Amino acid sequence: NANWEHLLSLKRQGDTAKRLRIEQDDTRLGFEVDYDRIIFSAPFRSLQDKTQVITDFVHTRLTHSLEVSVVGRSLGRMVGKKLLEKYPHLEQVYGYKFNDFGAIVAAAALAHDIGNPPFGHSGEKAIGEFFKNGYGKRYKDSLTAKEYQDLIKFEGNANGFKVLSQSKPGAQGGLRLSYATLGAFMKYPKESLPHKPSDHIADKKYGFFQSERALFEDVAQELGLLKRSTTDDVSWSRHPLAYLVEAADDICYTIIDFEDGINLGLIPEEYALEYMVKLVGQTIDRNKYNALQETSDRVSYLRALAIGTLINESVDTFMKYEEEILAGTFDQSLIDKSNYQAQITDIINLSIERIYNSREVIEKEIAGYEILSTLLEARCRALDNNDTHYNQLIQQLLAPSLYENLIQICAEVSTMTDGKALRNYKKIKGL
Amino acid sequence: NWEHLLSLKRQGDTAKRLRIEQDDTRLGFEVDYDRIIFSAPFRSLQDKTQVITDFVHTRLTHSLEVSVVGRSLGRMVGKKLLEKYPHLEQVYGYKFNDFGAIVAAAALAHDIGNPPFGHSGEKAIGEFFKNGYGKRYKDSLTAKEYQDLIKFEGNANGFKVLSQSKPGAQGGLRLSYATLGAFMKYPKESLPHKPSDHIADKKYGFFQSERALFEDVAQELGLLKRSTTDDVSWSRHPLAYLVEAADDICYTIIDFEDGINLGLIPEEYALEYMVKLVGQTIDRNKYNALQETSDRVSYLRALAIGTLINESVDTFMKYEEEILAGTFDQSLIDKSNYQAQITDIINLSIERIYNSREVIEKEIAGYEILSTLLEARCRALDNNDTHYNQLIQQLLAPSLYENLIQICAEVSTMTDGKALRNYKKIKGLD
Ligand SMILES: [Mn+2]
Numbered sequence: 001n002a003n004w005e006h007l008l009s010l011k012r013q014g015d016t017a018k019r020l021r022i023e024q025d026d027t028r029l030g031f032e033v034d035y036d037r038i039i040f041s042a043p044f045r046s047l048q049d050k051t052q053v054i055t056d057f058v059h060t061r062l063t064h065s066l067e068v069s070v071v072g073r074s075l076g077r078m079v080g081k082k083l084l085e086k087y088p089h090l091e092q093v094y095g096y097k098f099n100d101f102g103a104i105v106a107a108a109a110l111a112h113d114i115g116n117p118p119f120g121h122s123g124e125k126a127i128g129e130f131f132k133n134g135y136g137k138r139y140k141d142s143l144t145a146k147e148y149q150d151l152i153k154f155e156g157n158a159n160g161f162k163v164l165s166q167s168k169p170g171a172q173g174g175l176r177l178s179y180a181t182l183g184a185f186m187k188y189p190k191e192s193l194p195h196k197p198s199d200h201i202a203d204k205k206y207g208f209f210q211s212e213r214a215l216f217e218d219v220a221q222e223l224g225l226l227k228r229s230t231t232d233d234v235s236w237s238r239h240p241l242a243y244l245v246e247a248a249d250d251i252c253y254t255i256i257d258f259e260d261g262i263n264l265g266l267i268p269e270e271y272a273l274e275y276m277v278k279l280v281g282q283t284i285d286r287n288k289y290n291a292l293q294e295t296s297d298r299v300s301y302l303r304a305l306a307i308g309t310l311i312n313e314s315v316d317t318f319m320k321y322e323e324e325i326l327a328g329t330f331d332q333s334l335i336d337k338s339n340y341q342a343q344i345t346d347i348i349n350l351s352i353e354r355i356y357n358s359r360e361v362i363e364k365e366i367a368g369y370e371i372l373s374t375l376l377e378a379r380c381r382a383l384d385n386n387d388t389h390y391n392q393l394i395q396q397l398l399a400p401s402l403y404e405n406l407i408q409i410c411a412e413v414s415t416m417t418d419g420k421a422l423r424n425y426k427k428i429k430g431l
Numbered sequence: 432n433w434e435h436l437l438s439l440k441r442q443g444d445t446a447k448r449l450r451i452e453q454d455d456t457r458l459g460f461e462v463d464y465d466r467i468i469f470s471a472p473f474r475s476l477q478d479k480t481q482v483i484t485d486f487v488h489t490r491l492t493h494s495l496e497v498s499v500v501g502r503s504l505g506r507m508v509g510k511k512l513l514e515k516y517p518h519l520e521q522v523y524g525y526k527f528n529d530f531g532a533i534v535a536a537a538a539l540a541h542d543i544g545n546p547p548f549g550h551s552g553e554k555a556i557g558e559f560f561k562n563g564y565g566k567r568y569k570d571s572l573t574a575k576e577y578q579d580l581i582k583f584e585g586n587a588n589g590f591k592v593l594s595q596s597k598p599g600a601q602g603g604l605r606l607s608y609a610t611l612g613a614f615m616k617y618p619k620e621s622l623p624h625k626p627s628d629h630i631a632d633k634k635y636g637f638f639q640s641e642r643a644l645f646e647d648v649a650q651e652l653g654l655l656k657r658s659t660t661d662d663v664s665w666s667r668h669p670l671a672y673l674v675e676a677a678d679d680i681c682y683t684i685i686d687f688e689d690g691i692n693l694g695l696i697p698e699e700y701a702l703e704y705m706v707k708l709v710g711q712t713i714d715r716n717k718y719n720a721l722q723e724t725s726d727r728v729s730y731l732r733a734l735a736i737g738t739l740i741n742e743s744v745d746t747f748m749k750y751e752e753e754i755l756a757g758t759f760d761q762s763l764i765d766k767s768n769y770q771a772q773i774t775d776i777i778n779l780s781i782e783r784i785y786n787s788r789e790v791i792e793k794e795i796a797g798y799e800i801l802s803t804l805l806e807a808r809c810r811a812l813d814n815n816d817t818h819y820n821q822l823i824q825q826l827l828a829p830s831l832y833e834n835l836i837q838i839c840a841e842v843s844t845m846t847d848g849k850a851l852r853n854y855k856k857i858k859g860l861d
């Protein structure tokens with residue numbers, strides 16, 4: 001069974017001595033510094049020019065990441081305060097405070113989208129398609145089964161972990177986030193294989209590439225995560241705070257996708273109160289709602305309330321199943337146990353029908369397949385014959401072990417802004 | 432019999448519809464015209480370009496002008512047929528406006544199934560299945576089903592568009608069987624290919640998927656058999672000759688008028704090419720007082736179309752018996768006394784319009800656009816499990832032969848814009 005004293009590790013990669021919570025300066029608390037390191041990092045700043053499914057210029061992945069980190073800070077503060085009541089020795093002996101849990105969830109949430117390719121899950125699938133059926137199929141017999149699985153099922157979560165921890169000359173350990181933050185980041189503590197060994201949400205995807213396996217082994221050992229398999233296919237039970245990072249993300253994309261689609265016209269405004277009345281009625285001020293004269297103001301009032309309702313419930317679900325999560329025996333997400341799962345489901349379904357299957361979004365994702373394939377092919381052909389005049393040009397333009405080279409090409413194409421990607425694609429194509 | 436050729440039957444009818452008992456304000460031949468006007472495929476001709484993409488020479492206006500010339504041919508031939516066969520009016524109740532409405536409606540629809548980029552667009556579809564990706568399906572198709580694809584015809588796709596059953600809408604527009612017979616210039620299937628040099632044998636008029644329908648049409652109309660084998664062929668409905676003459680007249684004369692207005696044809700050539708066609712009716716002093724090029728040439732065009740309409744009526748009636756017996760071998764315009772001038776006009780249009788660099792550039796771009804969409808749809812058809820091919824199905828289209836012919840039908844009826852837009856997205860370019 002896992003221990004909250006080890007799960008709240010302040011260790012950073014390469015540390016030679018232990019970091020005790022009591023001995024920290026509260027003005028420079030490890031977990032809070034993690035948040036700043038992310039805000040100021042080049043991968044986070046690049047989210048300015050990375051659009052979500054809809055490209056209205058005011059629907060960015062930076063805003064999503066920001067709002068997920070805010071909701072995440074709330075979730076972790078409230079759970080953190082209840083956990084210190086249950087296990088008083090964590091504050092009495094180890095010096096932990098409730099804002100520590102707030103900070104861990106907030107930093108992991110803030111970073112949760114940092115490694116995703118452009119164009120959504122279509123972007124991930126364009127990359128996988130490239131190595132499964134495109135030019136990149138040629139590498140299959142030179143890679144291990146799990147190196148190849150990293151590629152053909154390329155996963156933005158796992159690319160995220162690489163962005164946060166990648167060593168470079170003069171920058172060992174990447175952003176060097178606290179291990180507790182890295183533990184909460186990891187929604188899927190498993191390798192690419194075996195694929196979907198169970199129906200648990202933690203088994204649905206994978207969380208780290210082969211290139212990062214040794215790194216997460218260090219994190220998992222320090223946190224004391226529970227070994228879920230020892231069959232040479234490593235996987236662990238989720239760090240408890242990872243459920244809150246997931247819940248914050250789930251809450252935001254459920255409610256705020258709905259809001260956005262109402263504002264963009266894709267969802268008639270009538271559905272707003274219809275799908276959300278159960279989630280708001282115990283807290284809504286009817287007088288205030290009927291005075292608001294603008295649709296955007298009405299639906300954002302409803303969204304603030306729906307999000308408040310879901311945070312409060314998610315805290316309760318965590319505390320109820322707290323011992324099962326600590327044992328690694330909790331099989332669902334926090335949101336899967338919500339009493340509003342009927343309402344959440346109808347919301348998600350309407351959002352899919354009217355937004356994610358809208359003609360604009362389908363078009364952006366189809367063009368994304370072509371943009372990502374073209375960039376991957378220019379990179380891989382340059383890797384294969386670095387001697388030609390053209391491939392040396394391509395090398396100066398796009399990038400000035402075989403598996404490490406391929407995964408790095410994937411990481412770099414994935415972290416390109418939409419601006420650099422399209423401009424470089426157009427250049428390659430003569431447009 | 433002309434009585435049977437003038438069928439008011441609609442697909443699925445279980446009882447004969449008699450001309451004498453029709454409501455004049457709701458006459459089936461004229462209802463056909465209205466159904467076409469309001470149909471979504473005819474409306475889409477607004478965003479379809481004939482050859483020059485000036486946005487003021489659409490396939491819609493061409494279709495309209497062909498139907499106007501058709502109604503005029505049908506009215507005049509109609510009046511003369513009722514004088515030759517008076518029982519048709521006095522006993523069966525036909526009127527001369529009936530023949531104008533049948534010809535007008537089939538002419539209005541004649542272009543409805545044609546792909547973008549003209550004949551280049553048909554040839555790109557065919558080349559996709561002869562030598563491109565679509566080659567793989569050859570062994571899974573009958574010879575006639577594959578021939579539908581490698582020699583894709585917009586005339587046959589027009590017939591499909593007009594008659595396709597969909598859930599809640601069996602039989603397409605459900606036009607009168609006379610209207611569909613007047614539509615079918617090539618009443619044969621895709622094989623055998625060009626069995627003679629007869630104009631009715633230069634292409635084919637229906638795909639295998641519409642074979643059963645046209646069989647029912649030909650039996651009701653009483654069209655004469657041209658084959659006693661399993662390769663079905665029939666002699667053209669007489670009125671199909673008038674639909675063809677309306678189209679022949681408009682493309683020859685109005686393409687020339689367009690070329691002059693556009694600058695592709697020097698205006699100096701206007702009178703030289705038209706003088707035989709207009710020389711006895713032209714008011715030369717009024718021609719010289721006209722101050723705009725566009726007015727001078729539209730005056731010449733109206734004179735020439737008038738000349739060619741009157742002659743075509745007279746050619747039809749000189750050969751009516753031969754046409755009723757399926758022994759007429761040519762088009763009406765082939766018998767014209769102005770055949771040589773018509774040929775000079777058409778050749779000048781080929782030289783100055785159809786072989787201009789702008790038109791050539793459009794067709795080359797068309798080949799890629801259609802080839803790309805056809806490959807995207809056909810790969811999506813073969814592996815509909817992958818994410819990309821789910822997306823391809825949602826963007827373009829939300830039995831193998833029935834599937835392949837439907838993909839050609841759908842790619843063919845796309846507006847110029849949506850084709851270029853969807854092509855641009857699949858290729859990533861804006
Ligand atoms: Mn997210």
Ligand SMILES: [Mn+2]
Nearest residue numbers: 497542678682
């Ligand atoms: Mn025509």
